[PDB]
Amino acid sequence: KKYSIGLAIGTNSVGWAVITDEYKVPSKKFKVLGNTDRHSIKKNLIGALLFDSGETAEATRLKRTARRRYTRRKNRICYLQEIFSNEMAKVDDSFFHRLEESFLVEEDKKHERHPIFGNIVDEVAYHEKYPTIYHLRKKLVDSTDKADLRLIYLALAHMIKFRGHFLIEGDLNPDNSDVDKLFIQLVQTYNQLFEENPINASGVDAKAILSARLSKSRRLENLIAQLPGEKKNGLFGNLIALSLGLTPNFKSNFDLAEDAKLQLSKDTYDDDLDNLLAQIGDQYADLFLAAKNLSDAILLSDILRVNTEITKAPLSASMIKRYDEHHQDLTLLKALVRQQLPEKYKEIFFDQSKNGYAGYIDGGASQEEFYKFIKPILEKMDGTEELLVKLNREDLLRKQRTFDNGSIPHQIHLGELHAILRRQEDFYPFLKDNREKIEKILTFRIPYYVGPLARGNSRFAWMTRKSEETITPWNFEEVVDKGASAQSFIERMTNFDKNLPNEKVLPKHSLLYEYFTVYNELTKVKYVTEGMRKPAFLSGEQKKAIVDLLFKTNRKVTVKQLKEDYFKKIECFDSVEISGVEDRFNASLGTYHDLLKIIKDKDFLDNEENEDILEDIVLTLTLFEDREMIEERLKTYAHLFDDKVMKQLKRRRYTGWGRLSRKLINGIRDKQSGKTILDFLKSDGFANRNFMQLIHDDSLTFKEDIQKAQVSGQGDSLHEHIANLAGSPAIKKGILQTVKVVDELVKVMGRHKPENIVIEMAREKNSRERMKRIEEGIKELGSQILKEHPVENTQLQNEKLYLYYLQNGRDMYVDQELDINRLSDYDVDAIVPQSFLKDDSIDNKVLTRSDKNRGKSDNVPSEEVVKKMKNYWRQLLNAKLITQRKFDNLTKAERGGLSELDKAGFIKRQLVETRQITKHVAQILDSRMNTKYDENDKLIREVKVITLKSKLVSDFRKDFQFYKVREINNYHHAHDAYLNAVVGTALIKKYPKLESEFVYGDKATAKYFFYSNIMNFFKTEITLEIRKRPLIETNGETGEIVWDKGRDFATVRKVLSMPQVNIVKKTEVQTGGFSKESILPKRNSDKLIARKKDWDPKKYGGFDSPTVAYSVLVVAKVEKGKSKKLKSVKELLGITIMERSSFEKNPIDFLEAKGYKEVKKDLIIKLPKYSLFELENGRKRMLASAGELQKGNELALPSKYVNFLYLASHYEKGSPEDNEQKQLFVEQHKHYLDEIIEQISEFSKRVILADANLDKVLSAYNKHRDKPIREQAENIIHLFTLTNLGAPAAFKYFDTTIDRKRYTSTKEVLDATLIHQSITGLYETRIDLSQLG
RNA sequence: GGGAAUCCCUUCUGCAGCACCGUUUUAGAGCUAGAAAUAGCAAGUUAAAAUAAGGCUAGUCCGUUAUCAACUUGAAAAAGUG
DNA sequence: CAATACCTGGAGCTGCAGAAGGTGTTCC
DNA sequence: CCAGGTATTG
Ligand SMILES: [K+]
Ligand SMILES: [K+]
Ligand SMILES: [K+]
Ligand SMILES: [K+]
Ligand SMILES: [K+]
Ligand SMILES: [K+]
Ligand SMILES: [K+]
Ligand SMILES: [K+]
Ligand SMILES: [K+]
Ligand SMILES: [K+]
Ligand SMILES: [K+]
Ligand SMILES: [Mg+2]
Ligand SMILES: [Mg+2]
Secondary structure (H helix, E strand, C coil), X not given: CCCEEEEXXXXXXXXXXXXXXXXXXXXXXXXXXXXXXXXXXXXECXXXXXXXXXXXXXXHHHHHHHHHHHHHHHHHHHHHHHHHHHHHHHHCCCHHHHHHCCCCCCCCXXXXXXXXXXXXXXXXXXXXXXXXHHHHHHHHHHCCCCCCHHHHHXXXXXXXXXXXXXXXXXXXXXXXXXXXXXXXXXXXXXXXXXXXXXXXXXXXXXXXXXXXXXXXXXXXXXXXXXXXXXXXXXXXXXXXXXXXXXXXXXXXXXXXXXXXXXXXXXCCHHHHHHHHHHHHCCCCHHHHHHHHHHHHHHHXXXXXXXXXXXXXXXXXXXXXXXXXXXXXHHXXXXXXXXXXXXXXXXXXXXXXXXXXXXXXXXXXXXXXXXXXXXHHHXXXXXXXXXXXXXXXXXXXXXXXXXXXXXXXXXXXXXXXXXXXXXXXXCCCHHHHHXXXXXXXXXXXXXXXXXXXXXXXXXXXXXXXXXXXXXXXXXXXXXXXXXXXXXXXXXXXXXXXXXXXXXXXXXXXXXHHHHHHHHHHHHHCCEXXXXXXXXXXXXXXXXXXXXXXXXXXXXXXXXXHHHHHHHHHCCXXXXXXXXXXXXCECCCCCHHHHHHHHHHCCHHHXXXXXXXXXXXXXXXXXXXXCCHHHXXXXXXXXXXXXXXXXXXXHHHCCCCCEEEEEHHXXXXXXXXXXXXXXXXXXXXXXXXXXXXXXXXHCCCCCHHHHHHHHCCCCCCCCHHHHHHCCCCCHHHHHHHHHHHHHHHHHHHHHCCCCCCEEEEEECXXXXXXXXXXXXXXXXXXXXXXXXXXXXXXXXHHHCHHHHHHHHCCCEXXXXXXXXXXXXXXXXXXXXXXXXXXXXXXXXXXXXXXXXXXXXXXXXXXXXXXXXXXXHHHHHHHHHCCCCCHHHHHHHCHHHHCCCCHHHHHHHHHHHHCCXXXXXXXXXXXXXXXXXXXXXXXXXXXXXXXXXXXXXXXXXXXXXXXXXXXXXXXXXXXXXXXXXXXXXXXXXXXXXXXXXXXXXXXXXXXXXXXXXXXXXXXXXXXXXXXXCCECCCEEECCCCCCEEEECCCHHHHHHHHHHCCCCEEEECCECCCCCCECCCCECCCCCCCCECXXXXXXXXXXXXXXXXXXEEEEEEEEEEEECCCCEXXXXXXXXXXECCCXXXXXXXXXXXXXXXXXXXXXXXXXXXXXXXXXXXXXXXCEEXXXXXXXXXXCCCCCCCHHHHHHHHHHCCCCCCCHXXXXXXHHHHXXXXXXHXXXXXXXXXXXXXXXXXXXXXXXXXXXXXXXXCCCHHHHHHHHHHHCCCXXXXXXXXXXXXXXXXXXCCECCCCHHHHCEEEEECCCCCCEEEEEHHHCC
């Protein structure tokens, strides 16, 4: 018996179907196991496995790193306390103990309830003197008096526990950075360069303007308005804009051809400045550096809003400013409300539920919610103008601990910490001996290239130690081998050379690697002149001359430079034709010119002796990122260069790696030639063999050595190999499930392998990314559209508005503005038409006033539109508002537009699968099926793995009226699998020559016509003009029949119409978090869970809502009443995720601890989520939890109703005669509507049992019977949510909402029939649970 | 058909370092008229500690991804069964 | 029990490797 | 978003 297998691989389902010779689906009697009447069951060999989505490891990683951070914060605190131990025991022998038990209730506290001093009077005195911690911090910074050791500890520990970010390298001293000074010095430098054009900065208050709480552009405009004759886009304007953090374009300031856009935040800036400084000279360096100093001052002024000359604690002083203004404004607001609207007073200052001040301080109201609640109250009253000004500045009634404190660097907390240490080391000797130790506690942070400081028990770790001892923040450099750890950080992640697997890959920017790339591109170039008979390769001498004259003197080498600076200058050619390179050479000696600028010794760079040295240096710049480690490694080459060059070398850094090893580039040699690969690239007679030819030439030893160097390590398992595939973890879950399904099907047929296996793989917060892209593009563009049109991230989920902002509010085809309020009138057009490229992303879509303005609809936007709009498109591209692909597609008309080959290739793409993950699935199935080799030792392909795209079966469904409606049931996955099998087998049977295209293993108009008409052999009348085809379609050579249009369509229809389809929902143990993360307040409830072993939730609160890993069926007895009489029970106990390890270690003890006695151990049944139970009248339920259920039946709606619903709802057209055809059918069969309702009702009454909902639904349907047929069908589609398999959900018929009727009791399944299903569902074990207990 | 190096993007997986909130219990003596419920007023901004229970391997480590119908032997691994 | 309504931790910043989609070149 | 936990109300 012969058969084939059709598969449909998706992120949540795997459809499967078995077909025979005649495209029929078999049906077998399968044995049924268990304790019920039934011993076997008839199963059709078609179905679909369903499962929850597989998740990325991202959430787990975030939680893990934050666990580590919490541990390390606690450890910092413990380090500090260890330092304070002895002298604090002298001062207060229970201070740290009161601190440790601060969370406990007075009942459980073993010491006095007041933490700091242990008596109420001293505590209240402290709090009256220091209402906030910043008061004590500033006092300890400024005062000369000896202080209480407890308060010293409190200030230092508050600084260490919340130490601030590390986004700034080097030190920081707030007294040196002052806006009023750096502005003046910038003016000094500017006026020194431009003596003829000086700026009068007198009377200009730089402090208030630049440090104002205003947007960057507004402060720029203010400062500009203070200086007459100087515009905002002038030199000084752009200097101030660079200082303020904008993206000014210095091109127009210096008449540059290169656009000098400079943003201080961008990582590229260090080069972006140097490059600019290479064009305008180094006299302007001092200027562009003074501007950066001013930027530093402004950024600090954002945080420190107080004069730094009255205190050495400007941060704490600004916090005290917050507190004092809060107090003053609160007093004023209370008085104002009392005078004008006292009745509101309570609601504002006593109701925590309301977003007033009461909900602000005591409730859950945020600063933003409180501002929103109180703004109308301030506008309504009189005297609130200053309070309103503070509100619009986000500076009213501010707390001290807020969201925006992330700006504070750690250097500032350190600046106050060191001050307090300097103050109090005069009175405490252990503070003098341990000053640097505490500073190090604050400042030391484990480097990212070191990772967890493990000792052989962390799979995430890689750190190697210099000595086996406990690592601390003070002995890190001596215990941790930072070099080996930073090296292993990278080497554990980089690829080896595939050709020489034992050799490490060269750095991407290695000098040898760039030499290789340049010579490899250069060897294949060819040139012709007049006297030449034939194009000729470049000799080794010509290549060396081109490298020395062009590649070693120009950053890039254009074709024009090749024609003029060489062929004309050297070869005396006035005209030459070049091939093998277009416009410019892709390769370039970038590292060569980098090191030429840094070291300024070209003879050193050209000398072959220094090669090694240079290589090492570049690698040291690529392998590392810490400038101290870079300096240490380059110290060996300290003698070679000056200290200036050495500093400039430290600064430059490289990221990225190549793909080939040095032992391959310039390592292995040919036995007879004695030449390396790079030697052959430099010169190879008149063959000019490049890399590929060199390593594939049998006349050379390279290929021999390549294979000889190949090792093969240990083989991966199926799961290991699937995990290591590049793809989404969800689709990998689907792939593994697919392979398991195929294994079980092969076992079903009787270990007979199928003829073919047809596979189809489906296609494939965000609003935050959209807002980030638009902000970056608009601020890089310099446009003010966000000022004039504010928008939230959610709003960008509208396609037209997102396109509007990506296009800066302009038509993309016409150089004109677009209106927001008229987006409904505009058009969204595909750049390359969707008839050729089925692409609906933003990358191929464009917002325009009218698509007519694109030109002809049959091609790429016309040449006229490109000439009009290329500059605007390039602006959008540099602003990253449009991608490279969008820009290249938009401008393709200037490059000939769409050729006929392009259209043929697009049609071919629509039908042939080129995705790599699909090829990997095909390879897995192929290697699992075909295992034997023939006489020539070549693979014997018994099973052909065909891969198809979705459009094939989609158009097949639309062309022969085998419609799908996804909401009706889950049968459409299995039907997709069956249709895949049918179409694929028939397609390769009709055209065997397509095997190379469609089977795994080893004129443009002609192919366009061919691939566009590949699927016409199913049709009877082609209408492409109206050709006809035979009723029987056979193979041309074999004469074998592939399709009988009279009989086979009926076969497919019968197969689709069959009601019994093996839908199996994958039963899965729940994993992840223990419960809801929210820490609830204390409450009299046994649903609360302790956050620590001794924290009784009735006193301290805790968690509730724990996630059940899996339920367990318990047959035992429980004590009843005060008498504790044993009463037999049979019930479901949900083992929570947190209870799982304890329950599995010893289930009997766990269950007895829960109250169960005499537990029948052998009747304990493990029931994961979605466990299937069947009841009366075939009614099924799925275990949603231990006390909640899900719908477990499928509504097998007949095929006539499904097709009617598709056609009537305008689901997705064709000829207008065929449109009237479909329509007249819909209108003739309107009586189906009622029938469909009936079919639903009889279903819901039999299986769903949602009486109230069903009656509401019937009323809703009878209410809208006068609605158009299309709309009634569209809402009948929604109706199927009531009958859909799985969890109940709310749906909506028109404007009536039907709330889900959840199943909140699981008692009935305790006497129903449990169903254990194999992966296909063909094999069942059914257990009658009524026979238990 | 498959594959490779290279220019230019773009997206997606994996990992490590760090902050800022939030929340929870406690500490910041509420006062006065009431027997009392309650009324009138005062006040509020800060901190400690925990942030998966916890584990042994005791590290400044690990603890939320992947994998899982049933049954037989198996300690597990696995293999086998219609 | 069953209807019903509400609830869910936010999601900054730095550094790194890799495969893979899209154009284009030179090749096995 | 989803959908399972929770209290409330009855
Ligand atoms: K990431
Ligand atoms: K006590
Ligand atoms: K001006
Ligand atoms: K609050
Ligand atoms: K090029
Ligand atoms: K680097
Ligand atoms: K899991
Ligand atoms: K899950
Ligand atoms: K490529
Ligand atoms: K209190
Ligand atoms: K299963
Ligand atoms: Mg912990
Ligand atoms: Mg806090």
